[PDB]
């Protein structure tokens, strides 16, 4: 019976590019999430929920992006631009209908991409199958 479900957080993330990599795995049932790349890979086709709560101190715009057959599919964004140097949590989430092999990841705005790095608090990326199609 289909289980795919993950949660991943940031602590020692490889930095580079606009993809937000959450390097520390908390849950990875069916191992759909790749912690080296920050990419979720769909094995079971169906409707999935994805959500993130990401800590910033300055400006941050994030988007849940997907791909099918390697073609990138941009989507909605979510921002906190308080820009006062104090913890703010930006969040977003959506249902995505995915086909086998589809990939899903968080991408930042190259002009607004501050993500807190440290041990005081956490940023999280999660996803789970709602029902197979």
């Amino acid at each position: 019976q289909p289980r795919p479900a993950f949660s991943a957080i940031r602590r020692n993330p490889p930095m580079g590019g606009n993809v937000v990599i959450f390097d520390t795995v908390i849950t990875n049932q069916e191992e759909p999430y790749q912690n080296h790349s920050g990419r979720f890979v769909c094995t079971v086709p169906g409707y999935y929920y994805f959500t993130f709560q990401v800590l910033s101190q300055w400006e941050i715009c994030l988007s849940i992006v997907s791909s099918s057959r390697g073609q990138v599919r941009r989507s909605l964004g979510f921002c906190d631009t308080t820009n006062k140097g104090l913890f703010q949590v930006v969040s977003g989430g959506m249902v995505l209908q995915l086909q086998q092999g589809d990939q899903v990841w968080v991408e930042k705005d190259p002009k607004k991409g501050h993500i807190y790095q440290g041990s005081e608090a956490d940023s999280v990326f999660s996803g789970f199958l709602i029902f197979p199609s």
């Binding site: 929920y49 909605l76 979510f78 820009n83 930006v90 969040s91 977003g92 249902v95």
Partner: protein, 131 residues
Amino acid sequence: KQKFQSVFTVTRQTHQPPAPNSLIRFNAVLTNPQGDYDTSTGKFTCKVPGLYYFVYHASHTANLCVLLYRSGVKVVTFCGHTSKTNQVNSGGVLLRLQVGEEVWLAVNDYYDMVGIQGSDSVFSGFLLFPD
């Protein structure tokens, strides 16, 4: 079988915010296969009875309170205050619904839903446990 499930993600695609003290219409669909969210009324209507999760993330650059309503009763309110910078107001709740029950989001006197470029507003709901 698709009609034995329930799921939607709708979004608000417009630059003008809702009127004060009004139901919030999400006019654009990301997914809504059973048609359970109605973009013309702004209301979700229960087709399949059971336990649902509802959650939203709304961008705003002035004060915003979002109220979630179930069959005429306000279930939860969450407010975010800001002045000219962008934040996300979020809220969510699990509810066991009967056929024909309506769910929707509304604002009060704090009604701003004007996100900066690249910051949107979303409302999702899905059936977890049928009966």
